[PDB]
């Protein structure tokens, strides 16, 4: 009956926990107490980008490490040129509550979405010369929280309906649907090989999905509150998750574990965005104390602070070449640090 | 710089000009978050002055108001309400005919009044069953003491105003609910946000006028607090 099924599920969970504990031999700290420190990393605001009307809720870096997309809940999607603080594009939105944006790897399309329930793909390379809504994706009974581009024709989304969805842009339908989340999924991170992706939700969990017709491969727990940011390791064998309990945690894909925790007794606000450097030594996280913190990803200690923001830092990103770190906050400002 | 860089700078300046033009409109439009319940008549209030979010744009004294009905969303709200940290007011609509679903409505004002990202945001209360409330309380089937005890130990406050003379045992019926909501909204967040109560009907006009008056008061108080006045 139902009791038997619940007992079987509890036994399976206990077996998974026991296997994880048995596989736990050495922590990250023990295998990193000997490597030399990364030193006092001191970045500075090189370019500050202004023009948005309201709070910036998401941003994404183009694959060229030069172009930027920023989403503002005035109903705007601005494409910047970070080298010359220039506004390449300014896309108005049918809705005004946008919680996510994404740049396609090719650079021909831009994703958008929010409380409107619909993922909008805009085409930046029309012959008419104006960015136009190329495809509206409906099928989500809840707010879109994060969208990512696999290629020019497939998109991956997470919504407030506790589900993720892999869409074919041409047909406009859901090629695959990922269920198994008991709360709003807020962020998802694409693997470098574009075959798997992690997704963090408000049920204090992060699940790993297989894009090519798959389901939840692994589940990762340990956060004491809602996970509202996620980012893969450059190897794709680990990922960092930020929660609003002032903790960013590192998990390893090959062991189903929590390698390290990045917390300080003097930080009590949430963590809105998380990102990684090119080499993986630095973990960057934006907090609700108007601050960005860079951490030595091997020896868990604070490496540096970027404190130029006057409101909640919402989005973070690191270029593909690791040249700079862009931070978008609620003062309608994006700042580049390197 | 090169020619194609100067032209890019010019394009950026044109984008900035258009953005300035849009910010003029954005700053002059007061965004309201319409947050009611299924039994509440919010879907009729929006129709009288007329998936995802539903935008309803109206204008009373040449001032643009933009209400946002949250539609096809889940049963949890603690996440997207952060997007409404900059709105002028939260219009909370409660149906007063249904006494049974009023404690549930009661334990939703507290989740809005006492929640962060909303301490500077005021709440406009719309009790939207006045005709239905009168119809229920004129009969004997409705019994406030039954659903809600301690109703007897309460009298109509000196500050009361039966509009068309109304009818006894009706004004007290409205004012018990009003006082309960205002007690929930009183003993917390003093000096940052205020609750404005209003008795209304679904087909009643001048509801937009009430929203206009409350927004005037909210912005007045915020502007006074910008100075060191109060």
């Amino acid at each position, epitope marked *: 009956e139902l009791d038997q099924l619940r007992q079987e599920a509890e036994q399976l969970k206990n077996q998974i926990r026991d296997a994880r504990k048995a596989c736990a031999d050495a922590t990250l700290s023990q295998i990193t107490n000997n490597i030399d420190p990364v030193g006092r990393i001191q970045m500075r605001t090189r370019r500050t980008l202004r023009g948005h009307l309201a709070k910036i809720y998401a941003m994404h870096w183009g694959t060229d490490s*030069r*172009l930027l997309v920023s989403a503002s809940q005035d109903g705007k999607l601005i494409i910047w*040129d970070s080298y*010359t603080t*220039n506004k*390449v*594009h300014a896309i108005p939105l049918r809705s005004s509550w946008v919680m996510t944006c994404a740049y396609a790897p090719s*650079g021909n399309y831009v994703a958008c979405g929010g409380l409107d329930n619909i993922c909008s793909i805009y085409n930046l*390379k029309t*012959r*008419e*010369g*104006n960015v136009r809504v190329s495809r509206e994706l409906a099928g989500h009974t809840g707010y879109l929280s994060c969208c990512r581009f696999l290629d020019d024709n497939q998109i991956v989304t997470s919504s407030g309906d506790t589900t993720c969805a892999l869409w074919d842009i041409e047909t406009g339908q859901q090629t695959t649907t990922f269920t198994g989340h008991t709360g709003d999924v807020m962020s998802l991170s694409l693997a470098p090989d574009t075959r798997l992706f992690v997704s963090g939700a408000c049920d204090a969990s992060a699940k790993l999905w297989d894009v090519r017709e798959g389901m939840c491969r692994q589940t990762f727990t340990g956060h004491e509150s809602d996970i509202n940011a996620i980012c893969f390791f450059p190897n794709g064998n680990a990922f960092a998750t930020g929660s609003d309990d002032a903790t960013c945690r590192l998990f390893d894909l090959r062991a189903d574990q929590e390698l390290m925790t990045y917390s300080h007794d003097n930080i009590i606000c949430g963590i809105t965005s998380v990102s990684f450097s090119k080499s993986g030594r630095l973990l960057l996280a934006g907090y609700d104390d108007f601050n960005c913190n860079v951490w030595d990803a091997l020896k868990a200690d604070r490496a540096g602070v970027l404190a130029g923001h006057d409101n909640r830092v919402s989005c973070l990103g690191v270029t593909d070449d690791g040249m700079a770190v862009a931070t978008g906050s609620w003062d309608s400002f994006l700042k580049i640090w390197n | 710089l*090169s*020619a*194609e*860089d*100067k*032209a*890019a700078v*010019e*394009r950026s300046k*044109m984008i900035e000009k258009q953005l300035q033009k849009d910010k003029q409109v954005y700053r002059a439009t007061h965004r309201l978050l319409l947050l009611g319940a299924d039994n509440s008549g919010k879907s009729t209030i929006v129709k009288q002055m007329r998936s995802g979010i539903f935008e309803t744009k109206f204008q009373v004294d040449k001032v643009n108001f933009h209400m946002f009905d949250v539609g096809a969303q889940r049963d949890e709200r603690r996440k997207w309400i952060q997007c409404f940290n900059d709105v002028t007011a939260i219009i909370f609509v409660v149906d007063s005919s249904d006494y049974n679903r009023l404690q549930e409505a009661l334990n939703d004002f507290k989740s809005i009044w006492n929640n962060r990202w909303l301490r500077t945001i005021s709440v406009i209360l719309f009790l939207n069953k006045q005709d239905l409330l009168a119809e229920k309380v004129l009969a004997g089937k409705s019994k406030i003491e039954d659903y809600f005890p301690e109703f007897a130990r309460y009298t109509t406050p000196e500050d009361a105003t039966p509009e068309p003379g109304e009818d006894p045992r009706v004004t007290r019926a409205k004012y018990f609910i009003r006082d309960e909501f205002l007690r929930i909204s009183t003993a917390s967040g003093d000096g940052r946000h205020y609750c404005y109560p209003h008795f209304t009907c679904s087909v009643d006009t001048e509801n937009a006028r009430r929203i206009f008056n409350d927004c005037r008061d909210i912005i007045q108080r915020m502007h006074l607090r910008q100075y060191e006045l109060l």
Partner: single-chain antibody, 230 residues
Framework: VQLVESGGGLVQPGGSRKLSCSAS????????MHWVRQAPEKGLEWVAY????????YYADTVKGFTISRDDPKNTLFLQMTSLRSEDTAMYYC??????????????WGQGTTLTVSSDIVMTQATSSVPVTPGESVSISCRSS???????????LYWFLQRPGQSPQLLIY???NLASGVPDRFSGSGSGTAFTLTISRLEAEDVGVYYC?????????FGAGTKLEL
């Protein structure tokens, strides 16, 4: 995407003609416009440019004081000819060009209207009668009197194709990037002060006249014009 134009014909040396260009299926209000001249049985030359919106207008050393204006609501680019010197009896082509990062200026061209009339970086394309057979490979060379390599590492050489009885079509922009909707068999290489365009497996649709453009200094200079006689 159509960029037609009209207003030409036979004009006396009195120097009075208005000549307009109407665009359909465009974002004409957000796209820069160019007027480009081509003398009969001769090469090309750049006449005028109007930026997005307005405020950035350039002229040649010959046509200065041939005014050019825009009409965004009607999508019409206007050219006023104040003189009818006999050297201006050239076909006039509208050019659509947008300048942002990664853009492709001189993307689409209109269809020229003939009006028969009764510092300056020099582009050299010496060869003009290259004989080729179908299925072979062609290589055209253009040279720059200055260095078309700004400090930002962006070469500004443009390769255009004009088949007989047809408007020029964009082939290569910035010496390395292929235009949209052109065969992949075309390629462009260079190192500054000297560039080449290579065509592999000529398919009998590549026969025409090839032109090279600078886009460093707004006085835009054309190549001599190499013709593949086939």
């Amino acid at each position: 995407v159509q960029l037609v134009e009209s207003g030409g014909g036979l004009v006396q040396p009195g120097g009075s003609r208005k000549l307009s260009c109407s665009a359909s299926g465009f974002a004409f209000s957000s796209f820069g416009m160019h007027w480009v001249r081509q003398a009969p049985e001769k090469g090309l030359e750049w006449v005028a440019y109007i930026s997005s919106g307005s405020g950035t207008i350039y002229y040649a050393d010959t046509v200065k004081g041939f005014t050019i204006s825009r009409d965004d609501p009607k999508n019409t680019l206007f050219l006023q000819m104040t003189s009818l010197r006999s050297e201006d009896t050239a076909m006039y082509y509208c050019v659509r060009s947008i300048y942002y990062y990664g853009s492709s200026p001189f993307d689409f061209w209109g269809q020229g209207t003939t009006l028969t009339v009764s510092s300056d970086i020099v582009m050299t394309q010496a060869t003009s009668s290259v004989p080729v057979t179908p299925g072979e490979s062609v290589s055209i060379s253009c040279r720059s009197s200055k260095s078309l390599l700004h400090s930002n590492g962006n070469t500004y050489l443009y390769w255009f194709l004009q088949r007989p009885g047809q408007s020029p079509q964009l082939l290569i922009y910035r010496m390395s990037n292929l235009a949209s909707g052109v065969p992949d068999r075309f390629s462009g290489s260079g190192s500054g002060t000297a560039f080449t365009l290579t065509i592999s497996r000529l398919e009998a649709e590549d026969v025409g006249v090839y032109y090279c453009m600078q886009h460093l200094e707004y006085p835009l200079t054309f190549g001599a014009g190499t013709k593949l006689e086939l």
